Structure 1
Amino acid sequence: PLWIRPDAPSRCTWQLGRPASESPHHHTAPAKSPKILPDILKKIGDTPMVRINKIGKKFGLKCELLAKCEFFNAGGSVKDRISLRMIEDAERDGTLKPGDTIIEPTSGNTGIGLALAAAVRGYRCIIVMPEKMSSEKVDVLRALGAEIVRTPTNARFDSPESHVGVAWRLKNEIPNSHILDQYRNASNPLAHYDTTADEILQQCDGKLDMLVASVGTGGTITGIARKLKEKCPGCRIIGVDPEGSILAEPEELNQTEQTTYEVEGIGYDFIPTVLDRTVVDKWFKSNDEEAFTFACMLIAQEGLLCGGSAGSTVAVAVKAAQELQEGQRCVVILPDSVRNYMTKFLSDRWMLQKGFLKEEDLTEKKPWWWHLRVQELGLSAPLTVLPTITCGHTIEILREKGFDQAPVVDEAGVILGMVTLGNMLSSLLAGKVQPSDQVGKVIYKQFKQIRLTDTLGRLSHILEMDHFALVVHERQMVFGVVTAIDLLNFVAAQERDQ
């Protein structure tokens, strides 16, 4: 029988007030990097501490709010730290030998860190992650040459189909395979205890009043809180847990209907052995809407390209830090980057689809013209030309009729593209085409179709993707041509008319 419960009680005999010299664990102090790094794994750590300048003030925080931006690690997540530490300790123990296989159950960020170390060091890497995790993590992992296995998102951890159970069964089927088991391996919280806490303390000169950290495995909050209680004992430790997790105390905070949430990498249905909850002074619950609202706000206001778990953490920080006054400081941990979330909360369609954005509030933020018809532009009906026409005859007709542009349409009525006088002349003058050459190449082939009855906001989004909007009916005849410049001229005209 070989399965080790990830929720087993910690056997750690650490308690507050013990001399640091009594630890049985091997500890590695942070060392200065050489001028030239031998490989990219030495670019893990020393992440910047950044002041939050606007958001803190907006919600009435009086204190200085600081963010530890962990997405600047090589893999773009906090887990790159623990992945390296877990490997290096396993190397020193002689457990892990060159060419062995590494297997890991992860929310993906840890998988990325381990796949990267394996690519550099030459381990085979097999990642087990829930189906709920974004595809961008899959694409990065596959590009690193990892094998990937998925598990149902609603599988309970004690089931054989949980990501942990599947990982253990695979380990039992793969020779010379090891599971480093981030939920139980002390190297995770120790990685944060030895380095991240020392970085935070050094950056703050040891002067710190509050820490906010979201908890997935607990390793970050456990390691930081333990070292901080030893060196900065006045610091309050605030845990962030999604609704639908059971990690928060007291249990009354966990009473809930929903069992699944969209934020990735935080919350679980079990208490990891490496999580020491007794060092958390208070828990706060967060939901998905709070997380994505604050993540998009963090990007748009502070320029921090980070993930949703960072949003949850700051969404809690603006509440928990209200008890602090001026001259005090709160530090928030920002675990990962937008790279893993490009098509989720960054895409407005997904946010609408999941119900995190209402159309009403969006319209309150939209310009006066956003709800207006394309017909209000007046437009003008363009000249059309056949595709068999020559470049020279196109220049002749365009100048003689006084048009700068024409849609290329056909006898069958298929619109093939655009030709412009400026580009036709530049291409001839540059010797790129001949007067006898077919327009086929110099044509601008890309455009989007619109109706006279569409809105100007719809035009704006098309112009975020395409230069030309052609106004059509479902007769293929073209009623008008629109660019970003025509819309801008209309808006600026209207701005003068008031």
Structure 2
Amino acid sequence: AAPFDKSKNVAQSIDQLIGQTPALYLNKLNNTKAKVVLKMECENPMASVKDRLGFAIYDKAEKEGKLIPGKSIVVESSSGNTGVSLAHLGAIRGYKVIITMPESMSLERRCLLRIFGAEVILTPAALGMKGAVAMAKKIVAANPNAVLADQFATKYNALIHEETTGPEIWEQTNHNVDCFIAGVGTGGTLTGVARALKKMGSHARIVAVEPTESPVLSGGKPGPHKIQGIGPGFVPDVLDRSLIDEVLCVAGDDAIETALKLTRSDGVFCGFSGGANVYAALKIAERPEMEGKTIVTVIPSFGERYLSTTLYRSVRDEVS
């Protein structure tokens, strides 16, 4: 992952286009005295931050001798972006990929993976995401060539963000970050950017966002919620809590409202978690102590993947 000016050279493979994403000031929606900078992970080649984790898993596991193309089978339970990035990169790298997900998932979630030739294993609807996780573990337990991508525990996750996401942010902001805010899914983005920032001498406050309706890091009970991509309902092993200065809860409805406003104000088109992250950033930006300071957050995924979800239903309903 050495820097590589995409705008001046021809890549030998699409995985060289992952990361080195743009950064963008929040402008019309930012009515505060603080700068808000959006790390545009929606601009990755398969349109989300999980492209960095997918690449890290194939790249680093192959380099360590743990994956062998044409022999290893990569397995994961995912109804979201990790599955997509695994299916995408697995195809070009010559791995069989198996993704498990409940039978009740939308046609779009299943069809996107099958485009890249992943095998999708549908689990009983009534068993929910737990039934998909169980099926993935059983597959890996039974077959010696089948390995779990292990997104919530893998050491590669925080590392890739430490090596790439965080240093890009550091360069883009000209070494000036007063607060870094990110919703925690696997915790990789938050943990790895916080490590890089700290090694650089930054005093940035590190803020983890989680859904108000599943406030686990806050000491509450796990619960179903709307903010796809964060709030896994347990504390993931990837996450290093020691680095977090503040856990901020954002309600699913504030995330949804914010995503809808962002498209029309700033032309940023994203999913629920980018709505939650910007809502959190604007909330921090309002605090009088943040006057003149620079807050960085992340836009994790591009909006087009959500057109069929509850995120844009208010527009769907209006359109009908």
Give the alignment's TM-score, normalised by structure 2: 0.91
| Equivalent of 1:237 in 206, 212, 230 | 206
1:78 matches 2:49: yes
Shift of 1:186: 0.8
Q: Corresponding residue for 2:271?
A: 307
Q: Corresponding residue for 2:313?
A: 347
Q: Corresponding residue for 1:40?
A: 14
| Rg (Cα) greater in structure | 1
Name the CA distance, whole Å, in 1 between partners of 2:284 and 2:150. Answer: 32
Alignment check: 8 A CA contact 1:108 1:133 kept: no
Higher relative contact order (CA 8 A, sep 6+): 2
Q: Corresponding residue for 1:194?
A: 163
Q: Corresponding residue for 2:300?
A: 335
The aligned amino acid for 2:38 is A
> What is the DSSP-based 3-state SS (H/G/I as helix, E as strand, rest coil) of the residue aligned with 2:153?
coil
Distance 1:314 1:155, change over 3 A: farther
| Equivalent of 1:92 in 63, 71, 84 | 63
Shift of 1:298: 0.8
The aligned amino acid for 1:66 is V
Name the CA distance, whole Å, in 2 between partners of 1:35 and 1:29. Answer: 14
Shift of 1:148: 1.4
The aligned amino acid for 2:297 is V
Q: Corresponding residue for 1:448?
A: none
| Equivalent of 2:25 in 51, 69, 94 | 51
Deviations 1:17-44 (A, max 9, x none): xxxxxxxxxxx65455571111211110
Name the CA distance, whole Å, in 1 between partners of 2:34 and 2:104. Answer: 37
The aligned amino acid for 2:305 is N
Instruction: Out of 74-83 and 264-273, give the one that drifted further.
Output: 264-273
Name the CA distance, whole Å, in 2 between partners of 1:221 and 1:154. Answer: 33
Alignment check: 8 A CA contact 1:248 1:285 kept: no
Name the CA distance, whole Å, in 2 between partners of 1:64 and 1:325. Answer: 9
> What is the DSSP-based 3-state SS (H/G/I as helix, E as strand, rest coil) of the residue aligned with 1:333?
strand
Name the CA distance, whole Å, in 2 between partners of 1:134 and 1:218. Answer: 26
| Equivalent of 2:250 in 286, 305, 317 | 286
Distance 1:30 1:184, change over 3 A: farther
Name the CA distance, whole Å, in 2 between partners of 1:198 and 1:301. Answer: 28
Deviations 1:321-362 (A, max 9, x none): 222444311111110011221112223376x6xxxxxxxxx9
Name the CA distance, whole Å, in 2 between partners of 1:78 and 1:106. Answer: 15
Distance 1:230 1:156, change over 3 A: farther
Shift of 1:164: 2.9
Alignment check: 8 A CA contact 1:210 1:321 kept: no
Shift of 1:153: 7.8
Distance 1:138 1:82, change over 3 A: same
Q: Corresponding residue for 2:135?
A: 166
Name the CA distance, whole Å, in 1 between partners of 2:35 and 2:105. Answer: 34
Deviations 1:229-259 (A, max 9, x none): 221431011111013434323x2xx268xx2
Determine which structure has the larger helix proportion and give its number.
2
1:228 matches 2:197: yes
Alignment check: 8 A CA contact 1:70 1:335 kept: yes
Structure 1 gap ranges (5+): 1-27, 353-361, 363-460, 463-498
Give the alignment's TM-score, normalised by structure 1: 0.59
> What is the DSSP-based 3-state SS (H/G/I as helix, E as strand, rest coil) of the residue aligned with 1:301?
helix
1:125 matches 2:91: no
Alignment check: 8 A CA contact 1:136 1:342 kept: no
Deviations 1:148-180 (A, max 9, x none): 1345688598xxx44332211011334511112
Shift of 1:105: 2.0
Shift of 1:289: 0.8
Name the CA distance, whole Å, in 2 between partners of 1:91 and 1:148. Answer: 23
Name the CA distance, whole Å, in 1 between partners of 2:102 and 2:38. Answer: 29
1:248 matches 2:217: yes
Name the CA distance, whole Å, in 1 between partners of 2:126 and 2:179. Answer: 34
Structure 2 gap ranges (5+): none
> What is the DSSP-based 3-state SS (H/G/I as helix, E as strand, rest coil) of the residue aligned with 2:301?
coil
Name the CA distance, whole Å, in 1 between partners of 2:124 and 2:181. Answer: 30
> What is the DSSP-based 3-state SS (H/G/I as helix, E as strand, rest coil) of the residue aligned with 2:16?
helix
